[PDB]
Design an enzyme around this catalytic site. Structure first.
Site, short mmCIF file in Angstrom:
data_model
loop_
_atom_site.label_atom_id
_atom_site.label_comp_id
_atom_site.label_asym_id
_atom_site.label_seq_id
_atom_site.Cartn_x
_atom_site.Cartn_y
_atom_site.Cartn_z
N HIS A 1 0.90 -1.17 0.00
CA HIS A 1 0.00 0.00 0.00
C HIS A 1 0.93 1.22 0.00
O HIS A 1 1.65 1.48 0.96
CB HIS A 1 -0.95 0.01 1.26
CG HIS A 1 -2.10 -1.03 1.15
ND1 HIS A 1 -2.67 -1.82 2.09
CD2 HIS A 1 -2.50 -1.32 -0.10
CE1 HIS A 1 -3.42 -2.63 1.37
NE2 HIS A 1 -3.31 -2.34 0.08
N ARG B 1 0.81 4.65 0.27
CA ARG B 1 0.84 5.78 1.19
C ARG B 1 1.37 5.43 2.58
O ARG B 1 1.55 6.31 3.42
CB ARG B 1 -0.58 6.39 1.35
CG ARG B 1 -1.56 5.36 1.90
CD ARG B 1 -2.92 5.92 2.19
NE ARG B 1 -3.83 4.84 2.56
CZ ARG B 1 -5.12 4.95 2.26
NH1 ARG B 1 -5.51 5.93 1.46
NH2 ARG B 1 -6.04 4.06 2.69
N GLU B 2 1.61 4.16 2.86
CA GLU B 2 2.06 3.74 4.18
C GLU B 2 3.56 3.96 4.25
O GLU B 2 4.35 3.03 4.39
CB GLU B 2 1.65 2.27 4.34
CG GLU B 2 0.11 2.14 4.38
CD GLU B 2 -0.60 0.74 4.41
OE1 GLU B 2 0.00 -0.29 4.33
OE2 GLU B 2 -1.79 0.68 4.58
N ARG C 1 -3.39 4.54 -2.42
CA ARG C 1 -3.17 3.23 -1.82
C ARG C 1 -2.95 2.14 -2.84
O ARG C 1 -2.15 1.22 -2.67
CB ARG C 1 -4.37 2.88 -0.98
CG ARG C 1 -4.56 1.42 -0.61
CD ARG C 1 -5.86 1.37 0.19
NE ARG C 1 -6.32 0.01 0.44
CZ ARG C 1 -6.07 -0.58 1.61
NH1 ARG C 1 -5.35 0.08 2.50
NH2 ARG C 1 -6.54 -1.80 1.90
N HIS D 1 2.60 -3.41 6.94
CA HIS D 1 1.69 -2.34 6.61
C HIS D 1 1.70 -1.32 7.75
O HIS D 1 2.45 -1.42 8.73
CB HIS D 1 0.25 -2.88 6.46
CG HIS D 1 -0.12 -3.69 5.22
ND1 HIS D 1 -1.19 -3.44 4.41
CD2 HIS D 1 0.58 -4.79 4.89
CE1 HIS D 1 -1.10 -4.47 3.57
NE2 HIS D 1 -0.10 -5.26 3.88
N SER D 2 0.88 -0.27 7.65
CA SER D 2 0.63 0.64 8.78
C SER D 2 -0.75 1.23 8.50
O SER D 2 -1.23 1.23 7.37
CB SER D 2 1.67 1.81 8.92
OG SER D 2 1.59 2.78 7.88
N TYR E 1 -10.33 -5.96 10.73
CA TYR E 1 -11.65 -6.07 10.14
C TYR E 1 -11.71 -7.15 9.09
O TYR E 1 -10.69 -7.78 8.82
CB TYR E 1 -12.11 -4.75 9.51
CG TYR E 1 -11.04 -4.05 8.70
CD1 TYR E 1 -10.40 -4.70 7.67
CD2 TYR E 1 -10.70 -2.76 9.01
CE1 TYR E 1 -9.42 -4.07 6.95
CE2 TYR E 1 -9.72 -2.13 8.29
CZ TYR E 1 -9.09 -2.79 7.28
OH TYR E 1 -8.07 -2.15 6.57
N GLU F 1 1.12 -4.33 11.49
CA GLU F 1 0.58 -3.01 11.22
C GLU F 1 1.39 -2.05 12.09
O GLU F 1 1.21 -2.01 13.29
CB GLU F 1 -0.89 -2.91 11.63
CG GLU F 1 -1.76 -3.86 10.80
CD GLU F 1 -2.02 -3.38 9.38
OE1 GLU F 1 -1.89 -2.19 9.15
OE2 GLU F 1 -2.39 -4.19 8.51
C1 LIG Z 1 -8.16 0.48 3.70
C2 LIG Z 1 -7.88 1.23 5.01
N1 LIG Z 1 -8.46 2.53 5.00
C3 LIG Z 1 -8.50 3.37 6.04
O1 LIG Z 1 -8.90 4.48 5.88
O2 LIG Z 1 -8.08 2.91 7.18
C4 LIG Z 1 -8.13 3.70 8.34
C5 LIG Z 1 -7.84 2.92 9.50
C6 LIG Z 1 -6.66 3.05 10.14
C7 LIG Z 1 -6.39 2.29 11.22
C8 LIG Z 1 -7.30 1.40 11.66
C9 LIG Z 1 -8.48 1.28 11.02
C10 LIG Z 1 -8.75 2.03 9.94
C11 LIG Z 1 -6.45 1.16 5.24
O3 LIG Z 1 -5.62 1.75 4.61
N2 LIG Z 1 -6.04 0.26 6.19
C12 LIG Z 1 -4.72 0.06 6.54
P1 LIG Z 1 -4.01 -1.39 6.07
O4 LIG Z 1 -3.70 -1.39 4.55
O5 LIG Z 1 -2.83 -1.48 7.07
O6 LIG Z 1 -4.97 -2.64 6.53
C13 LIG Z 1 -4.70 -3.96 5.99
C14 LIG Z 1 -5.40 -5.10 6.73
C15 LIG Z 1 -5.16 -6.45 6.29
C16 LIG Z 1 -4.00 -7.07 6.58
C17 LIG Z 1 -3.78 -8.34 6.17
C18 LIG Z 1 -4.71 -8.98 5.43
C19 LIG Z 1 -5.87 -8.35 5.13
C20 LIG Z 1 -6.09 -7.09 5.55
C21 LIG Z 1 -5.47 -3.92 4.78
O7 LIG Z 1 -6.51 -3.35 4.71
O8 LIG Z 1 -4.97 -4.54 3.73
ZN LIG Z 2 -1.90 -1.46 4.02
#
Ligand SMILES: C[C@H](NC(=O)OCc1ccccc1)C(=O)NCP(=O)(O)O[C@@H](Cc1ccccc1)C(=O)O
Ligand SMILES: [Zn+2]
Length: 307
Positions: A69, A71-72, A127, A196-197, A248, A270
């Site tokens: 992703h 922007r992280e 993203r 990720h973050s 989630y 994360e």
């Molecule tokens: C889409 C989402 N939008 C967003 O706006 O998230 C805000 C948020 C921040 C913190 C907590 C909750 C929500 C995002 O970028 N989330 C961060 P992420 O990319 O770190 O989350 C992983 C979670 C994940 C990890 C492993 C497997 C599946 C899913 C993902 O969505 O891919």
């Molecule tokens: Zn991510």
């Protein structure tokens, strides 16, 4: 820079600085690190993986990818500091040295080059990848919704304009497929780590179903340990558990795919923080964040090596 020693780790870098850093490191440690090109992005940029290895034939390996992703930004900067960390500690640190003497480590610092380039020139919060959906004018696919694990099921969007769009079929994004193919061809990965973050979580499968993986007790105990080692440095608190349960529902995520391929130690970290700065974590936080997340990752590699 002119050597990775004068390189500045406490600042965010552009795509060119990071790729040039990779060449500096390989040049400085030609018998420990090599740069492999595993594909080209949708817009035509090379996708690189650094292999750290002390020799051997098809040694058991550890996969770690960062920046899927774009922007992280704390994840690409952590990846750059990891890569330096590996050449410093191999030889001085005894558990790391012992891991590298029997295992190979594969590190992908910029998993999504096109979106990363885009966060610098035009949109810091981009993203997705930058593939063009001909069926649509919205650009890009969420690469962590495009793996073949519960693909296209609840936990992802089927709208092209969504920043959670799963894409048209699994592995449609070449940035995903390039890893899938490298990781099926090798055949000997024992751990798969995707960084990720943000939110300070350590997650294991599954993201698309509440059903339990068969090895939940073990991954849970491993997570418990990594989180405790991570917290040892600056007291940073992490929660841990399955994806669906801890952040989630998400479908098509990469660690559900590597775990379904047989790779038991599949976890996603994360990183910092929990929301105050979110994706725009100040640069003063790169080093403390990279140091502590290294202690958690070293814990997992140690369990991997012996179990
Ligand atoms: C889409 C989402 N939008 C967003 O706006 O998230 C805000 C948020 C921040 C913190 C907590 C909750 C929500 C995002 O970028 N989330 C961060 P992420 O990319 O770190 O989350 C992983 C979670 C994940 C990890 C492993 C497997 C599946 C899913 C993902 O969505 O891919
Ligand atoms: Zn991510």
């Amino acid at each position: 820079a002119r050597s990775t020693n004068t390189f500045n780790y406490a600042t965010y870098h552009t795509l060119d600085e990071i790729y040039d850093f990779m060449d500096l490191l390989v040049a400085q440690h030609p018998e420990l690190v090599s740069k492999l090109q595993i594909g080209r992005s949708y817009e035509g940029r090379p996708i690189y993986v650094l292999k750290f290895s002390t020799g051997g034939s098809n040694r058991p390996a550890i996969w770690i990818d960062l920046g899927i992703h774009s922007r992280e930004w704390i994840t690409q900067a952590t990846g750059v500091w990891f890569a330096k960390k590996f050449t410093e500690n191999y030889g001085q640190n005894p558990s790391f040295t012992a891991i590298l003497d029997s295992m190979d480590i594969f590190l992908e610092i910029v998993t999504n080059p096109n979106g990363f380039a885009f966060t610098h020139s035009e949109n810091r919060l981009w993203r997705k990848t930058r593939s063009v959906t001909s069926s649509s004018l919205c650009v890009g696919v969420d690469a962590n919704r495009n793996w073949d694990a519960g693909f296209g099921k609840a936990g992802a969007s089927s709208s092209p304009c969504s920043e959670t769009y799963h894409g048209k079929y699994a592995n449609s994004e070449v940035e995903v497929k390039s890893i899938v193919d490298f990781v099926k061809n090798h055949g000997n990965f024992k751990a798969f780590l995707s960084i990720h973050s943000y939110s300070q979580l350590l997650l294991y499968p599954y993201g698309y179903t509440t059903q339990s993986i068969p090895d939940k007790t073990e991954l849970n105990q491993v997570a418990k340990s990594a989180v405790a080692a991570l917290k040892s440095l600056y007291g940073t608190s992490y929660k841990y558990g399955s994806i669906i349960t801890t952040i989630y529902q998400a479908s098509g995520g990469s660690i559900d795919w590597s775990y379904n391929q047989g790779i038991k130690y599949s976890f996603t970290f994360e990183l910092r923080d929990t929301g105050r700065y979110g994706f725009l974590l100040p640069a003063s936080q790169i080093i403390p964040t990279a140091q502590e997340t290294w202690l958690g990752v070293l814990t997992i590699m140690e369990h991997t090596v012996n179990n």
